[PDB]
Amino acid sequence: NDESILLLTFLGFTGLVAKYLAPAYKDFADARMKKVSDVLNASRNKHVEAVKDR
Amino acid sequence: MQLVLAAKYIGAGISTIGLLGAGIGIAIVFAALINGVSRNPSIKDTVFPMAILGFALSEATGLFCLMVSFLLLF
Amino acid sequence: MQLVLAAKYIGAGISTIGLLGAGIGIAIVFAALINGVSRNPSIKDTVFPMAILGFALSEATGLFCLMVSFLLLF
Amino acid sequence: MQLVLAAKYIGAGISTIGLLGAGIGIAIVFAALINGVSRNPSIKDTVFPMAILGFALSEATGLFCLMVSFLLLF
Amino acid sequence: MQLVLAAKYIGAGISTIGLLGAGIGIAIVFAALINGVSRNPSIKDTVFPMAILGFALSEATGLFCLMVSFLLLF
Amino acid sequence: MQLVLAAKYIGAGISTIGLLGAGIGIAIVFAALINGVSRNPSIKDTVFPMAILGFALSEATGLFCLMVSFLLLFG
Amino acid sequence: MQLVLAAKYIGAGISTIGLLGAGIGIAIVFAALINGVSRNPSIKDTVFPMAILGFALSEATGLFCLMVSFLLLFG
Amino acid sequence: MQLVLAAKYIGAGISTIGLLGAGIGIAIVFAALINGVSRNPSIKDTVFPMAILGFALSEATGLFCLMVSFLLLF
Amino acid sequence: MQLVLAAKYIGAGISTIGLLGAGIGIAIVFAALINGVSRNPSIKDTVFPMAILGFALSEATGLFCLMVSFLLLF
Amino acid sequence: MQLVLAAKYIGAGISTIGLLGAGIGIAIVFAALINGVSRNPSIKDTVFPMAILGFALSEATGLFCLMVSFLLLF
Amino acid sequence: MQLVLAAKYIGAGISTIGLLGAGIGIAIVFAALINGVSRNPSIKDTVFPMAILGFALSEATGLFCLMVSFLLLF
Amino acid sequence: ESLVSKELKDLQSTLDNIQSARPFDELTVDDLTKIKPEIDAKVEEMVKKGKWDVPGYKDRFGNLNVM
Amino acid sequence: FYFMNQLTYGFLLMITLLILFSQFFLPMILRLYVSRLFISKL
Amino acid sequence: LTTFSLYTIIVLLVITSLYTLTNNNNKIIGSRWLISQEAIYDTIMNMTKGQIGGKNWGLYFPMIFTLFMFIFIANLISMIPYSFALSAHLVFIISLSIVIWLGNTILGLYKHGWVFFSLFVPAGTPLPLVPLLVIIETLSYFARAISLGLRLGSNILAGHLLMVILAGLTFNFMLINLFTLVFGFVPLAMILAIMMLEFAIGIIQGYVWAILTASYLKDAVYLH
Amino acid sequence: PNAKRIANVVHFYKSLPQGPAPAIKANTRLARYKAKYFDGDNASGKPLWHFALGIIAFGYSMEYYFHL
Amino acid sequence: MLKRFPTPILKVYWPFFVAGAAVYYGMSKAADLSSNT
Ligand SMILES: CC[C@H]1/C=C/C=C/C[C@@H](C)[C@H](O)[C@@](C)(O)C(=O)[C@@H](C)[C@H](O)[C@@H](C)C(=O)[C@@H](C)[C@H](O)[C@@H](C)/C=C\C(=O)O[C@@H]2[C@H](C)[C@H](CC1)O[C@]1(CC[C@H](C)[C@H](C[C@@H](C)O)O1)[C@H]2C
Ligand SMILES: CC[C@H]1/C=C\C=C/C[C@@H](C)[C@H](O)[C@@](C)(O)C(=O)[C@@H](C)[C@H](O)[C@@H](C)C(=O)[C@@H](C)[C@H](O)[C@@H](C)/C=C/C(=O)O[C@@H]2[C@H](C)[C@H](CC1)O[C@]1(CC[C@H](C)[C@H](C[C@@H](C)O)O1)[C@H]2C
Ligand SMILES: CC[C@H]1/C=C\C=C/C[C@@H](C)[C@H](O)[C@@](C)(O)C(=O)[C@@H](C)[C@H](O)[C@@H](C)C(=O)[C@@H](C)[C@H](O)[C@@H](C)/C=C\C(=O)O[C@@H]2[C@H](C)[C@H](CC1)O[C@]1(CC[C@H](C)[C@H](C[C@@H](C)O)O1)[C@H]2C
Ligand SMILES: CC[C@H]1/C=C\C=C/C[C@@H](C)[C@H](O)[C@@](C)(O)C(=O)[C@@H](C)[C@H](O)[C@@H](C)C(=O)[C@@H](C)[C@H](O)[C@@H](C)/C=C\C(=O)O[C@@H]2[C@H](C)[C@H](CC1)O[C@]1(CC[C@H](C)[C@H](C[C@@H](C)O)O1)[C@H]2C
């Protein structure tokens, strides 16, 4: 079929995606996740420290 | 009249490449924009509102040849 | 015969690609405006009128191009 | 009859060189981008979209010509 | 008889695009004018008349081109 | 029909020089890249990917030209 | 014989766009003039003749082009 | 019937100036290659491989045209 | 017989705008001249003979162009 | 079959205008060479070889386009 | 057979504008040469032979072009 | 004398409750709305006026946008 | 043939998405913004 | 039922499939699937903040979002090979552009009445050309309308058809004698690069739509 | 001072201990799909690819219903 | 599920819907008058 070559191109593209972009996007999301969670925990930690200092 | 339609078709053809400046002009505007904001950062929101206006005025006249090509195809 | 109207159409086609120069020229006008204001912002208010001066009557010569096509189109 | 399709084909041929505009335009955009990030390493973000933005404005103009060729080719 | 006036029309068409030089240069003049007046503001009164000088005796030449078109249209 | 293929061939001819755009463009891109890496020694690995980015989807336009010159030539 | 006058007319048409050269040329000359007089305000009368000099016998050459068209419209 | 080969030959002729781009293009590269060492005599053997690589895959563009010219002559 | 002279005339037409090149090129010489003395006043004795030398033997190109056009005309 | 060699000739006519690119580029090469050696006269035996080699290699633009004509002339 | 000579004439007509870039290229060389000698006035006798060398072979493109025009005229 | 004896044990009970009731890695905004209607009220006023820009957010929380 | 088809279903979806986004999906994330900033500021 | 209507239902279902199943029972932590829409929201927010910059600027922030997502989604669904182009229809895209343009005009007329036509006089100009500068913009104002959409459509129509035409290329390249199977990989990588540029001509063109219509709302709401 | 104290004594008392959000048998013949692919733990892009296959099938079936 | 918030979609975006209806009516005229080609 003619258009089957286009499906093969799409398969190769998504293979390259799952090989390169998927782990990079995973690492970016994990970095942002860790930053947000750490700041969210530090807010409550400083709140508890200021409550104990009172 | 199996001759004038071929001529108007090739006339839309020659009047298609008139957007050549639209391919070049707008770009060099952004060129200076990249040479403008990268030199002085804090003029971004001052040069960009007129940069998009220059783009609009550049694709305005860079498109009338293309609509001439449209209306000359039909 | 049928050679007059076909040639009129192809002439309206050829006589429209001259706006290339007007488009490139107004584009470099905006480019120079950007390159100049980013070096000294406090002169924009003085140079921006003259700039849009230098814009208008630099496109006007290009504005004739499609006009010459219009009277040749009909 | 056997003249209009040959004319449509040669019109698709003549209208093809309209992509010259994009090839000249997007190039100086990337050139100015490289020059701006070269003399200012920590501004690339501020100028990374604004460059490729202009790309999608010049590239598209090129993407005009050949499609006007395509609807002239068929 | 029917062959010569159509050729005159297409001659006006091919000769119309000579305003390319006007559209480019009568704008490069203002581009350099802005680039000069931005880096040195107080020289406008020294340059701006002479500057607009460099416009007229240029664009008029380009005008000649298309007025030839008129004497080739009629 | 015995005449249309000659016009197809000359159309592929006129629709081939459109890579003038790519030839000028990728060249001036590499020229600006040379200038940048010269005036900034420690930026190469930062600009060369982007630069070659500004090659690939900067040359496809020219490709379009000859693929026209591939379809009107053969097909 | 009925083709020769239309040929002369379209020749006067094609030979008319040569003043593109003068239009760009005198313009770059005046651009450089503005760039020089704005960079050194004490040079005007020193560069103004040459500049306008660089004008005339440049654009006159371009003029020659269309005067060919003149002698191609009737002669 | 004698029109098809003459058309092939004039088509090989009209498609000659595509490498026109290369004719200027690659040269511009060496231009920067000269300006990349005048203001920076130190870095030579690092910019030269990049410059020759750019030369190679820019000339390739010049070719993709003269091989079309070759296979159209045949 | 009645076509060869019309061909000679249109050939003199198509061989005319080559002086286009000189028509631009020579000008930039004066440009550098204005860009040579504006920042270095006492340099005329060194640059002006060289400038006019270049001007003359570069305008020789357009001279040969239009004299080819004239000899092909008659 | 007298049309085929006439067509070969007229197609070789616009195959020699491929050195346009050469005529511009192999000249801007020496332009950049001059603009670079004047900034640092001591680096002459280092860049001149380099400067040339590019001239040689980049040349042939017109030479490989002018061969078409000759090949196309004979 | 009465067309081959007219075809040679008109092909010589469309083989003349190939020196176009010559009329620009070599010219701008001298421009840079001015920028070479007016910037560093201690380089005239050093790079003037280099300049005339870069001129000669580079104009040689226009030499080839117009001499092909001659040999096609006859 | 009794005011401090009450206010100290109040904060002591608060600290003893917060030490074992911090599901910050799995907290739900529904619980915040159920304990704080101020969140919903501020969102409602912000949408009605249109102050989609939330001040004091970009400094400690990066905008994370493409540009 | 299908000008009315495309245009009418497209406008239906346009009004649908306008109301849908503006009423549900922008403010549901604005809620997350406000919750984070309210836990930070306290 | 129409393929286009079913494609509209697909767009709506995918948009719902970007937030509803994304939200892990209303968690503050902002899971990975939510970070995509987080970034989209932030890059549209910080865009339209600096574009129009008005004291009351977020009021039109909903539309600048819903005009983007529609274009961001309807140009990533048809990316699947065995599908049909959604946005390549010039009629519908130009109609949407005309709708937005006429809405902006009516908004400006209802907000400023007579003085709304003060946009056509940008800055100080000499007298003998005061109407002239208005002219080009006079016709340019409505060329702004037709072009705004005509660009993206003419991109999408030029994109998908492209991926079709050269497809037949590699189809007509591998039915001649089997010796064509050697070094027949660079057209495959060329189509790969075509899809690479396709994704750009979708996403970055949606961005372009958003930024141009943001500038146009700025011009229609404020008088320079 | 007093403001932070009177704020955090109210913010904390109703907050649930730790974790605990299994929601019994969270399922509805579609919800499981979300628990398998759409939680903060897995968050893998596979469904997109899966959804792609859907269109890769759907249009193909539509192909199977229109052209072939 | 998703809590509904009363956000202004009518008292803000009325001219856009007016223009949409006007373009629908214009296309009605266009495809009821030019559909005979
Ligand atoms: C072979 C491809 C090109 C380069 C390859 C290698 C050559 C080295 C290069 C540095 C030069 O040729 C050179 C400097 O080395 C060189 O020519 C020297 C040997 C020579 O002594 C030099 C000092 C010159 O004076 C030389 C440039 C000529 O004498 C000068 C009058 C003009 C140029 C000229 O006619 O040469 C051309 C040129 C080399 C060109 C370009 C040659 O070649 C000639 C012969 C082939 C055809 C006829 C071309 C036509 C051209 C217009 O395309 O003209 C050849 C005829
Ligand atoms: C073919 C793939 C490319 C490969 C890599 C790029 C660089 C080549 C490199 C490895 C060479 O060694 C070189 C460039 O360094 C080189 O030639 C030097 C070593 C050499 O000493 C140099 C000074 C020369 O003498 C050389 C310029 C020759 O004298 C000169 C006659 C070459 C002609 C020319 O234009 O070269 C091109 C070029 C190599 C180009 C580019 C070659 O190739 C040719 C032949 C193939 C086609 C015809 C192309 C494009 C056009 C002519 O169609 O032109 C080929 C014709
Ligand atoms: C080798 C080419 C040129 C010769 C000499 C160049 C350099 C030497 C230098 C000292 C010259 O005398 C010169 C630069 O001063 C010069 O050009 C003068 C003669 C010139 O008159 C100049 C001083 C002026 O007066 C100048 C201010 C005028 O405005 C200018 C329009 C003069 C006339 C002119 O351009 O005519 C041309 C020109 C002389 C040109 C110049 C010829 O010659 C004419 C002769 C007839 C034909 C038609 C040529 C063709 C044209 C394209 O060159 O044009 C001739 C018709
Ligand atoms: C290899 C090409 C060139 C040869 C040598 C180049 C460099 C060496 C250098 C020392 C030369 O002698 C030169 C630069 O000084 C030079 O060009 C002189 C001969 C020239 O006369 C120069 C000093 C002048 O007098 C100059 C001020 C004149 O205004 C100029 C119009 C001279 C004549 C001229 O251009 O004629 C050309 C030219 C010599 C050109 C130059 C030829 O030759 C002629 C010969 C006939 C044919 C028609 C060619 C074609 C033309 C396109 O080159 O033109 C010939 C017809």
From Swiss-Prot, chains B, C, D, E, H, I, J, K:
SUPFAM superfamilies registered for this protein in UniProt: F1F0 ATP synthase subunit C (SSF81333)
Site entry: Reversibly protonated during proton transport: E59
Listed InterPro entries: ATP_synth_F0_csu, ATP_synth_F0_csu_DDCD_BS, ATP_synth_F0_csu_sf, ATPase_proteolipid_c-like_dom, F/V-ATP_Csub_sf
Residue runs in coiled coils: none
Chief location of this protein within or outside the cell: mitochondrion
Taxonomy, superkingdom: Eukaryota
Entry membrane topology: Multi-pass membrane protein
UniProt subcellular location: Mitochondrion membrane
Stretches that traverse the bilayer: 14-34, 52-72
This protein's name: ATP synthase subunit 9, mitochondrial
Highest classification ranks of the organism: Eukaryota, Fungi, Dikarya, Ascomycota, Saccharomycotina
Gene transcribed to yield this protein: OLI1
From Swiss-Prot, chain M:
Broad class of where this protein is predominantly found: mitochondrion
Keyword check for Transmembrane: yes
Record field: transmembrane: 7-26
Pfam families according to UniProt: Fun_ATP-synt_8
Entry keyword Cell membrane: no
One annotated Gene Ontology cellular component of this protein: mitochondrial inner membrane
Keywords: ATP synthesis, CF(0), Hydrogen ion transport, Ion transport, Membrane, Mitochondrion, Transmembrane, Transmembrane helix, Transport
Membrane topology annotation: Single-pass membrane protein
Compartments it resides in: Mitochondrion membrane
Biological process terms in GO annotation: proton motive force-driven ATP synthesis
GO molecular function: proton transmembrane transporter activity
InterPro entries attached to this UniProt entry: ATP_synth_su8_fun
Family note: Belongs to the ATPase protein 8 family.
Self-association state and partner proteins as the record states: F-type ATPases have 2 components, CF(1) - the catalytic core - and CF(0) - the membrane proton channel. In yeast, the dimeric form of ATP synthase consists of 17 polypeptides: alpha, beta, gamma, delta, epsilon, 4 (B), 5 (OSCP), 6 (A), 8, 9 (C), d, E (Tim11), f, g, h, i/j and k.
Name recorded for this polypeptide: ATP synthase protein 8
Organism: Saccharomyces cerevisiae (strain ATCC 204508 / S288c) (Baker's yeast)
Designated gene of the protein: ATP8
From Swiss-Prot, chain N:
Main location: mitochondrion
Membrane association type: Multi-pass membrane protein
Gene3D superfamilies: ATP synthase, F0 complex, subunit A
Transmembrane segments: 1-21, 57-77, 90-110, 115-135, 156-176, 181-201
Covalent S-S links between cysteines: none
Transport as UniProt keyword: yes
Effect of A210T: In strain: D273-10B/A1
Consequence of substituting F142I: In strain: D273-10B/A1
Gene Ontology molecular function, alphabetical: proton transmembrane transporter activity
Origin superkingdom: Eukaryota
Record's keyword terms, sorted: ATP synthesis, CF(0), Hydrogen ion transport, Ion transport, Membrane, Mitochondrion, Mitochondrion inner membrane, Transmembrane, Transmembrane helix, Transport
Location(s) in or outside the cell: Mitochondrion inner membrane
Pfam families: ATP-synt_A
Effect of G206S: In strain: D273-10B/A1
Similarity-based family: Belongs to the ATPase A chain family.
Subunit relationships: F-type ATPases have 2 components, CF(1) - the catalytic core - and CF(0) - the membrane proton channel. In yeast, the dimeric form of ATP synthase consists of 17 polypeptides: alpha, beta, gamma, delta, epsilon, 4 (B), 5 (OSCP), 6 (A), 8, 9 (C), d, E (Tim11), f, g, h, i/j and k.
PANTHER family in the cross-refs: ATP SYNTHASE SUBUNIT A
Protein name: ATP synthase subunit a
Gene behind the chain: ATP6
Swiss-Prot record, chain P:
Compartment(s): Mitochondrion membrane
Keyword terms of this UniProt record: ATP synthesis, CF(0), Hydrogen ion transport, Ion transport, Membrane, Mitochondrion, Transmembrane, Transmembrane helix, Transport
One GO cellular component, as annotated: mitochondrion
Predominant cellular place of this UniProt entry's protein: mitochondrion
Segments crossing the lipid bilayer: 9-25
Keyword Transmembrane helix among record annotations: yes
Membrane topology: Single-pass membrane protein
A GO term, aspect molecular function: proton transmembrane transporter activity
Family as reported in the entry's similarity comment: Belongs to the ATPase j subunit family.
Function: Mitochondrial membrane ATP synthase (F(1)F(0) ATP synthase or Complex V) produces ATP from ADP in the presence of a proton gradient across the membrane which is generated by electron transport complexes of the respiratory chain. F-type ATPases consist of two structural domains, F(1) - containing the extramembraneous catalytic core and F(0) - containing the membrane proton channel, linked together by a central stalk and a peripheral stalk. During catalysis, ATP synthesis in the catalytic domain of F(1) is coupled via a rotary mechanism of the central stalk subunits to proton translocation.
Misc note: Present with 6540 molecules/cell in log phase SD medium.
Name listed for the protein in its UniProt record: ATP synthase subunit J, mitochondrial
Shown part of the complete sequence: 1 to 37 of 59
